[PDB]
Amino acid sequence: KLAQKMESNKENREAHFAAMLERLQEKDKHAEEVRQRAIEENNNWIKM
Amino acid sequence: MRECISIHVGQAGVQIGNACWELYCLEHGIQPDGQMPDDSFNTFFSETGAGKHVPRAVFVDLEPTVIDEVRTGTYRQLFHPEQLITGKEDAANNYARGHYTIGKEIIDLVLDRIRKLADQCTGLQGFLVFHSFGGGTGSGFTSLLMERLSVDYGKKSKLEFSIYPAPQVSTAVVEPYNSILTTHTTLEHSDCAFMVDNEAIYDICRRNLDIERPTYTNLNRLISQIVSSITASLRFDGALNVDLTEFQTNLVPYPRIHFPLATYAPVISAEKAYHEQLSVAEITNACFEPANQMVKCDPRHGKYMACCLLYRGDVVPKDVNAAIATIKTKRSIQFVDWCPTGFKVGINYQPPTVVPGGDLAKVQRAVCMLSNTTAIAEAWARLDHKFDLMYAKRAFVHWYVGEGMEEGEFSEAREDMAALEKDYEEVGVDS
Amino acid sequence: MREIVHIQAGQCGNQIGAKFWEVISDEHGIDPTGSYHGDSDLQLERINVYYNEATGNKYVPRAILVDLEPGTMDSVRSGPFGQIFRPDNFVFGQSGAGNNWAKGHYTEGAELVDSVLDVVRKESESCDCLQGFQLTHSLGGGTGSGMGTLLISKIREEYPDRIMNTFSVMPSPKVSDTVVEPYNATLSVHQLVENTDETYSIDNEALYDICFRTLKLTTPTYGDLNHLVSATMSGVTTCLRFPGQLNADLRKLAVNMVPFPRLHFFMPGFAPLTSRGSQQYRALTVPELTQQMFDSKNMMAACDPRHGRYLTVAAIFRGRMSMKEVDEQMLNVQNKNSSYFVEWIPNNVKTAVCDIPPRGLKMSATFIGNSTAIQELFKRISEQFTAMFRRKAFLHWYTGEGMDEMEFTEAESNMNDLVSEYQQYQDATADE
Numbered sequence: 001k002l003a004q005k006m007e008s009n010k011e012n013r014e015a016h017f018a019a020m021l022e023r024l025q026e027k028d029k030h031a032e033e034v035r036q037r038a039i040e041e042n043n044n045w046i047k048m
Numbered sequence: 049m050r051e052c053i054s055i056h057v058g059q060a061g062v063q064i065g066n067a068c069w070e071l072y073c074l075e076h077g078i079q080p081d082g083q084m085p086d087d088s089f090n091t092f093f094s095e096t097g098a099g100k101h102v103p104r105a106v107f108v109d110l111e112p113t114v115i116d117e118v119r120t121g122t123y124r125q126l127f128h129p130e131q132l133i134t135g136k137e138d139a140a141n142n143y144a145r146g147h148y149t150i151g152k153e154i155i156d157l158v159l160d161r162i163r164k165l166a167d168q169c170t171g172l173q174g175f176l177v178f179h180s181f182g183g184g185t186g187s188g189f190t191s192l193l194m195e196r197l198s199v200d201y202g203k204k205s206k207l208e209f210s211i212y213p214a215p216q217v218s219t220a221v222v223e224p225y226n227s228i229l230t231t232h233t234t235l236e237h238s239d240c241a242f243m244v245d246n247e248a249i250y251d252i253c254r255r256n257l258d259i260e261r262p263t264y265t266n267l268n269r270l271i272s273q274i275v276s277s278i279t280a281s282l283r284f285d286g287a288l289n290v291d292l293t294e295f296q297t298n299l300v301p302y303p304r305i306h307f308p309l310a311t312y313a314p315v316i317s318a319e320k321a322y323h324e325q326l327s328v329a330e331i332t333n334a335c336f337e338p339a340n341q342m343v344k345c346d347p348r349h350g351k352y353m354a355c356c357l358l359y360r361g362d363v364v365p366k367d368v369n370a371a372i373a374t375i376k377t378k379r380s381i382q383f384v385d386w387c388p389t390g391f392k393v394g395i396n397y398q399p400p401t402v403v404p405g406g407d408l409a410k411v412q413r414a415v416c417m418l419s420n421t422t423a424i425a426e427a428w429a430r431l432d433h434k435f436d437l438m439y440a441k442r443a444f445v446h447w448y449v450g451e452g453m454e455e456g457e458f459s460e461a462r463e464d465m466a467a468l469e470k471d472y473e474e475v476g477v478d479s
Numbered sequence: 480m481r482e483i484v485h486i487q488a489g490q491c492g493n494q495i496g497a498k499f500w501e502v503i504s505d506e507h508g509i510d511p512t513g514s515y516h517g518d519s520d521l522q523l524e525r526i527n528v529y530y531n532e533a534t535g536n537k538y539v540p541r542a543i544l545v546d547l548e549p550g551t552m553d554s555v556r557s558g559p560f561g562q563i564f565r566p567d568n569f570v571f572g573q574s575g576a577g578n579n580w581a582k583g584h585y586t587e588g589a590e591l592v593d594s595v596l597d598v599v600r601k602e603s604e605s606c607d608c609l610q611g612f613q614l615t616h617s618l619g620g621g622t623g624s625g626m627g628t629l630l631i632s633k634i635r636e637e638y639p640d641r642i643m644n645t646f647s648v649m650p651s652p653k654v655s656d657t658v659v660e661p662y663n664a665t666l667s668v669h670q671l672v673e674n675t676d677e678t679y680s681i682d683n684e685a686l687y688d689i690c691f692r693t694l695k696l697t698t699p700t701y702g703d704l705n706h707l708v709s710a711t712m713s714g715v716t717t718c719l720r721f722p723g724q725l726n727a728d729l730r731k732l733a734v735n736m737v738p739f740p741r742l743h744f745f746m747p748g749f750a751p752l753t754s755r756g757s758q759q760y761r762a763l764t765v766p767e768l769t770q771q772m773f774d775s776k777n778m779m780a781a782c783d784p785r786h787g788r789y790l791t792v793a794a795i796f797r798g799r800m801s802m803k804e805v806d807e808q809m810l811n812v813q814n815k816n817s818s819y820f821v822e823w824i825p826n827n828v829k830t831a832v833c834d835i836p837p838r839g840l841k842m843s844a845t846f847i848g849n850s851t852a853i854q855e856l857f858k859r860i861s862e863q864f865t866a867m868f869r870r871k872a873f874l875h876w877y878t879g880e881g882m883d884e885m886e887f888t889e890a891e892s893n894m895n896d897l898v899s900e901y902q903q904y905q906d907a908t909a910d911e
């Protein structure tokens with residue numbers, strides 16, 4: 001009774017922190033992306 | 049022989065425990081080091097090879113602050129260090145942290161200590177659990193512990209001394225949530241629970257003891273007196289006694305309707321000297337006054353199902369029966385139609401003992417009435433309404449969900465409380 | 480719950496942070512060498528919340544000092560309590576942020592961030608039980624704002640279960656060093672809504688108005704504004720650093736103050752209002768202290784509390800006074816001003832009394848309110864932002880750093896949603 005209440009709990013906090021880092025890691029994937037773009041456009045400018 | 053294990057959970061439970069054990073020591077003549085210069089006190093105190101008397105108790109808190117005071121205090125030698133258990137991180141007024149997140153780390157250690165105490169018992173009667181409804185430890189850890197105790201102890205008696213929250217002394221906005229969650233989870237695991245409304249105690253201290261701004265020290269001394277009255281029958285051998293089982297048999301007619309109302313008298317200030325000595329009639333009359341109640345509610349608007357009167361000190365059976373007879377002539381005390389025998393009376397020889405330097409005056413005779421009244425449902429209704437106000441907006445719910453709790457657990461807990469209120473209503477109807 | 484790790488970022492962050500440390504060191508009886516010379520056991524009871532105990536009788540602030548510019552750090556070291564700080568805890572760059580959020584958040588700030596995390600990890604791993612973090616910074620600048628929010632995100636990644644607290648100073652045209660402050664503030668607010676558990680909204684608009692109108696200081700300086708900030712910071716942290724029942728730790732404070740995750744922006748208030756020089760003063764009774772809770776004149780955020788409703792309130796009284804009088808006065812205010820408190824959060828006003836008053840005052844009161852009126856501060860920023868953004872003015876400073884227009888649109892929309900959310904609960908009823 002308790003096993004299938006605390007396991008169902010441990011799953012519902014791993015999720016409420018999975019959805020955290022997963023959705024606050026693409027928050028670094030985008031900060032890499034526009035950051036690559038930052039000196040990329042600066043380079044292809046000197047290409048002209 | 050007939051041992052009782054006391055468990056003190058969270059700040060409220062631990063602090064009330066300090067007051068109770070201080071009072072028990074004064075009553076049995078036990079010094080703060082466990083030394084002492086009847087024999088029934090052995091139900092609550094074990095004895096070591098050095099002739100020292102040790103409380104059959106476990107003190108638990110998820111934060112160390114409160115218990116650290118016990119292990120530095122006057123009674124540091126009374127308890128063995130292993131029976132004072134503390135974590136590092138508190139439950140932060142969150143039932144989910146107490147029950148799940150933080151509680152799950154210390155639960156096994158607490159049960160191992162309780163097992164060691166139970167192994168020293170030849171006839172363990174069961175447990176007395178002290179906790180607040182409002183704190184994260186008092187609510188969350190208690191329900192976790194109660195569930196685990198039912199597993200390990202089969203059908204061993206479990207009685208509660210629950211601190212019902214009051215806004216005058218409340219520390220969290222989320223106390224109604226914690227109160228409902230703990231009541232739902234603990235209901236199927238508790239045999240009998242004595243609620244103590246902090247507002248009722250706050251008002252008695254203000255009105256009867258002339259304390260302008262009552263502190264937990266003031267509240268706990270008064271609480272300790274009621275706990276001592278309930279437990280005196282176990283710790284002493286008087287003319288009329290009641291064990292763990294007889295309390296339940298006389299006061300609990302149905303499994304879920306296990307919440308008796310406590311009323312204590314007299315509560316006299318340590319000044320005056322003229323305001324005494326009160327007769328058996330006077331103290332008995334005081335039990336039927338809503339001002340002396342431990343929970344705020346109106347019995348005149350409810351129905352009684354059982355009334356237990358626990359007298360202490362210079363009390364004679366003839367005096368008691370005379371007092372009960374005059375009270376019976378006051379038509380206003382209504383009982384349910386399926387209940388004939390209303391009054392169970394107990395007399396314990398020892399007059400109430402008071403803490404030196406305390407607010408309470410020394411009296412020759414006192415009484416504690418335990419009554420199972422449908423009027424106690426009013427306390428559940430007040431709590432349920434505060435829960436509903438916040439829950440309709442899901443205010444603060446994210447704190448519990450974040451700890452792994454599901455919203456469904458809130459609905460389940462509230463539906464169970466609705467069923468409890470419905471049970472008190474059904475019980476008061478005539479056939 | 481024990482240790483709090485303090486972080487100071489940017490010019491404003493370091494200036495306000497340094498003042499916080501000199502104010503609290505004086506309250507805890509700690510001199511500029513780290514030695515305790517006080518005469519009250521209450522001063523040391525919870526000393527470990529902000530200080531590490533070093534070899535012998537010495538106490539060291541658990542503080543990390545950060546800037547992309549070196550000058551501010553030198554000014555801190557040269558200061559009165561400058562020598563108290565851990566030398567290894569000063570983390571500074573050489574290439575500043577030039578009041579550009581993009582430089583602080585993506586470029587220069589990103590290059591320094593790891594050196595800062597290395598120092599925060601050292602302090603965090605030393606902790607018996609880390610409560611979380613406390614950051615002081617401005618939202619109008621580049622380092623405090625951009626790097627500060629970058630640090631919040633990086634710390635949150637490594638410590639997702641710890642409490643994240645900030646003292647965020649809002650920019651104002653009244654005391655402005657740059658025309659781009661609405662952009663920097665909006666971009667930062669977007670970050671704080673998502674990444675902090677609690678934010679004290681310290682408004683320069685309100686601080687300037689208090690100095691000019693109330694303190695009668697014709698030309699306020701940052702020194703004058705910072706005197707109000709340090710009085711507020713001392714007040715709001717009283718519960719964390721002295722023994723008490725209410726809001727004793729960062730989590731308990733958040734649990735009592737935050738009903739909805741995003742609505743974690745507090746409106747601080749303080750009474751009595753004093754100027755640096757004013758060591759007079761002879762005034763302030765309990766009814767007088769209590770009345771200033773609804774007084775817009777005493778708010779550290781330029782919002783009228785009577786323009787909204789309080790979701791939750793924490794009130795801290797300091798000095799030798801009657802607890803009975805405080806309880807009566809506090810109940811009177813809630814009964815008289817019923818309409819300014821939400822009915823669906825019962826007993827939402829919590830009071831604490833600390834015997835130790837702040838320096839110079841015998842009696843003081845600090846208010847922490849979670850009010851729907853804070854939407855006035857966010858509306859002000861959104862309207863200043865839109866006036867500029869409509870014309871794409873100064874956008875080249877940000878796009879030049881690799882930023883896209885979408886981030887600006889998103890930050891603005893998120894802040895407007897926050898305003899809309901405050902309005903929703905302002906209009907909500909207990910009709911059930």
Ligand SMILES: Nc1nc2c(ncn2[C@@H]2O[C@H](COP(=O)(O)OP(=O)(O)OP(=O)(O)O)[C@@H](O)[C@H]2O)c(=O)[nH]1
Nearest residue numbers: 058059060063138139140141180182183184185186
């Ligand atoms: N009568 C009485 N009530 C108390 C005492 N201490 C706390 N309470 C009440 O209990 C509630 C607060 O819960 P606590 O027991 O302090 O908290 P806790 O169990 O330690 O849980 P956490 O601190 O959240 O981990 C409020 O209703 C208080 O008024 C006490 O010594 N006596």
Ligand SMILES: Nc1nc2c(ncn2[C@@H]2O[C@H](COP(=O)(O)OP(=O)(O)O)[C@@H](O)[C@H]2O)c(=O)[nH]1
Nearest residue numbers: 489490491494617619620621622623650654701
């Ligand atoms: N209250 C206060 N505000 C300041 C102080 N210094 C700068 N500011 C404000 O902070 C903003 C400018 O940011 P600043 O901290 O100088 O830039 P940074 O070094 O890149 O973080 C503006 O809103 C200024 O009005 C200070 O000491 N006190």
Ligand SMILES: [Mg+2]
Nearest residue numbers: 059111138183
């Ligand atoms: Mg506690």
